[PDB]
Amino acid sequence: TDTEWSAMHTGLGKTDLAVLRETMSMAEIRDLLSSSKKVKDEISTLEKEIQNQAGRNWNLVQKKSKQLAQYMIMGEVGNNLLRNAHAISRLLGERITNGPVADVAAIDKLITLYSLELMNKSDRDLLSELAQSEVEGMEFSIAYMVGQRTEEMRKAKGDNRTLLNHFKGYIPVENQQGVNLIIADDKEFAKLNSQSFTRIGTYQGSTGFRTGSKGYYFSPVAARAPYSQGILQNVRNTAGGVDIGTGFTLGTMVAGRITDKPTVERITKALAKGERGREPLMPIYNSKGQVVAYEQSVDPNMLKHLNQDNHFAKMVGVWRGRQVEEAKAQRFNDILIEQLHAMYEKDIKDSSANKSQYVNLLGKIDDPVLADAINLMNIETRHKAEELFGKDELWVRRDMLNDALGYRAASIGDVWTGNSRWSPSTLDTVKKMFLGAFGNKAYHVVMNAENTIQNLVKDAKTVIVVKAVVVPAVNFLANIYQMIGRGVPVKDIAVNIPRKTSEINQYIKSRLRQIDAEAELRAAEGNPNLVRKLKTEIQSITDSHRRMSIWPLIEAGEFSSIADAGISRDDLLVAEGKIHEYMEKLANKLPEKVRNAGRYALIAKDTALFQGIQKTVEYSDFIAKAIIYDDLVKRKKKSSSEALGQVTEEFINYDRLPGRFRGYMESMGLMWFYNFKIRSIKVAMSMIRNNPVHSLIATVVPAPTMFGNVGLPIQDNMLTMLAEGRLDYSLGFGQGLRAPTLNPWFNLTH
């Protein structure tokens, strides 16, 4: 029954029963579950033995082992929680101790025996009958948990920082498909005026940290954007429920994380007096026994709303299928190191003077923030690099390394804390660019810095126009962030987009007279006076085209694939910069019964407004390739044919991918989300070949749009509300300024 599967999940899984196989046979374990007196007898003899070794520290060892058993079952967090027996053996945060106070293995047995007594009486009765009538089934299930435990222990024992911080008795659990629970600030949430969230409680916090009023908000079943929920979306390996190397938690949800040195020392001596609150803070311990961070826990009662599943058979399959995926991503990083060594070998062989353009990564690092991230690098990749190069050797090209660190000149904040945003200088540069490219009216309704979009529309017809301008705006802004991340300087784009817009603008105007001068040539079959005038006119225009800076793109044909496919008078608005008014003109051609349906109106693929959006989208790609081509030629020193080779592999023709969704459904915003997804896959595949150093760095050095979920409550980006059809946001302030991640291997698989 479904109740028996849940009892087995709590008994075998959450109590870490696999640790008993070190000293007891499989038949003896089945005897413990069938007799409560045996459990009480084992505790009595185990307590006496540990008391002799512990000595005067017996009171503290007993207290901390009982507190841990409370968390593993009922989820309660006490004061100064120690997550495993390795930390309890050293009594971190209680007394200064130079080693294990007692036997680590003995303490492990006592902790899991204590938590076995905390289980429900009805729950224990179910396990007793199964252990007697299903002998062959129960033994096989126990053996699976032994295999799951060894893999985690193999990764955890590699580093001492993650050895003292991994959770004991961790087993995955999944929420209900569709629901969402977040913790948000009260004042910031009020101004959004969202109509899908309900406040279900308040966040009290602890007395050691002072902050603004917070609360819990819950969202019932709905439809969410793809690749935003249901997966961990983490680019780092996890052992024991925490990140390998740092010790930060990723298998659960926390309200925040504090890592700054001056602030952490402020919390430390405030909790020495005492702690009070429903949500105490959990510390993170160093290798020497100090404290390096703090975390904000979550009330266990608020997790009941998520309707979590605890099916033992299903969650083991999720556990093993996730360990395999982590192993494959680990092996991929080893092959990249082999390629980096092969390139370094040839250059030195050709000439001994080529070593002047290489930097030792594992050696001394001058940059402090860069150096700290290097130390916490995964230990499995460190040994592989040392195997090929030598003792503390990792040489990479200096020019390729500078590109991978071009993000830090424009971003501020810390990724782990969760407050990494663009610098105010960067925003004032991007904001002025969108106003010039798009219409002035469009800027007022899209990037309003005080009000959301839904608060600025008060007519049923204006909803259709507003929902159409969003799609080109998202594509225009997404490309700017993506090219900024890849090392292109900010000041280059700021001075080149107006230059390229002007060059493109005069192209259609000049092409307009040439596109119909052939009609006059057909009517010029006669006296040479008509021919003489036409011949000079057409040749003069073409000579002007030859001198344009974007000419090489024109000859390739990709720059004029759709320019010559159709000429209309209203399309001059797009080239001028009146996109918002260009949408109104095509909106009035809709039927009266459709225009007045507002957000309920279904737009067909045959209408003129539908094809107007597609024309504008390819007009944004008009400028994207122009900037990239200059970058690969001016500051990269590449041939005019090499640059055009790379451009063709990062853009696709959208006429081959019509929507394939149901009728009677608003699939306008969902179709463009999937189209933009495929183009991101091609970009990631190109970055691997043309920049092996950047791909390896992206999973080592924290950076915005480089790491996925960090354990904090799920946050959206610009690409998320586009697919969901919402309007309670704006692309100019707060949320909505975030861009999707750029990790190459992450995008290929997720």
Q: How many Å apart are CA 735 and CA 731, to the nearest integer?
A: 7
Identity of the amino acid at 723: A
Beta strands in 666-716 (DSSP E): none
- Positive/negative CA dihedral, 590, 591, 596, 602: negative
Nearest Cα neighbor of 394 from 347, 337, 342 is 337
135-156 helix and 26-33 helix, angle to the nearest 10 degrees: 110
461 Cβ partners below 8 Å, 6+ apart?
A: 587, 595, 596, 598
Length of the chain: 750
Report the SS3 class of residue 697. Answer: helix
Report the SS3 class of residue 257. Answer: strand
130 Cβ partners below 8 Å, 6+ apart?
A: 4, 8, 137, 138
For 566, which DSSP code? -
Residue pair 256/214 in contact by the 8 Å Cβ criterion: no
Q: How many Å apart are CA 700 and CA 376, to the nearest integer?
A: 9
Nearest Cα neighbor of 297 from 277, 270, 269, 267 is 277
Report the SS3 class of residue 693. Answer: helix
* Residue 397 φ then ψ, to 5°: -70, 140
Residue pair 660/584 in contact by the 8 Å Cβ criterion: no
Three-state SS annotation for 523-560: CCCCCHHHHHHHHHHHHHHHHHHHCCCCHHHHHHCHHH
Residue pair 446/472 in contact by the 8 Å Cβ criterion: no
Q: Which residue has the tokens 């009805």?
A: 122
Identity of the amino acid at 566: G
Q: How many Å apart are CA 472 and CA 235, to the nearest integer?
A: 30
Q: Report CA-CA distances (Å) from 337 to 139, 295, 355, 385, 386.
A: 43, 35, 18, 7, 10
Q: How many Å apart are CA 534 and CA 321, to the nearest integer?
A: 71
Instruction: Give me the sheet containing 214-219, strands edge to edge.
Output: 180-185, 214-219, 198-203
Q: How many Å apart are CA 9 and CA 239, to the nearest integer?
A: 20
Backbone break loci in the chain, preceding residues, C–N > 2.5 A: none
579-587 helix and 460-485 helix, angle to the nearest 10 degrees: 140
Nearest Cα neighbor of 208 from 265, 291, 285 is 265
Q: How many Å apart are CA 91 and CA 89, to the nearest integer?
A: 6
Residue pair 685/705 in contact by the 8 Å Cβ criterion: no
Nearest Cα neighbor of 201 from 181, 216, 183 is 216
Residue pair 626/553 in contact by the 8 Å Cβ criterion: yes
Helix (H) or strand (E) holding 434: helix 424-437
Residue pair 118/203 in contact by the 8 Å Cβ criterion: no
Q: Report CA-CA distances (Å) from 690 to 314, 334, 486, 632.
A: 41, 18, 12, 12
Residue pair 94/8 in contact by the 8 Å Cβ criterion: no
Q: Which residue has the tokens 């006429």?
A: 655
Three-state SS annotation for 287-311: CCCCEEEEEECCCHHHHHHHCCECC
Identity of the amino acid at 486: R
Q: Report CA-CA distances (Å) from 192 to 444, 613, 725.
A: 18, 28, 16
What method did the depositors use to determine the structure?
Answer: cryo-EM
Residue pair 497/631 in contact by the 8 Å Cβ criterion: no
Q: How many Å apart are CA 179 and CA 224, to the nearest integer?
A: 9
Torsion of CA 697, 703, 707, 712, to 10 degrees: 150
Residue 707 CB burial class (10 angstroms; 0-12, 13-18, ≥19): buried
Neighbours of 534 (CB within 10 A): 16
Chain centre to alpha carbon of residue 308: 23
Q: Which two tokens stand for residue 446?
A: 């899209």
Q: How many CA atoms lie within 13 A of 25 on its CB side?
A: 3
Q: How many Å apart are CA 50 and CA 107, to the nearest integer?
A: 8
151 Cβ partners below 8 Å, 6+ apart?
A: 323
Strand partners of residue 395: 360
End-to-end CA distance of the chain: 35
User: What's the maximum distance between 2 C-alpha atoms anywhere in the chain?
Assistant: 119
Specified resolution (Å): 2.8
Q: Which residue has the tokens 């009538």?
A: 133
Residue pair 355/348 in contact by the 8 Å Cβ criterion: yes
Report the SS3 class of residue 184. Answer: strand
DSSP symbols for 40-74: HHHHHHHHHHHHHHHGGGHHHHHHHHHHHHHHHHH
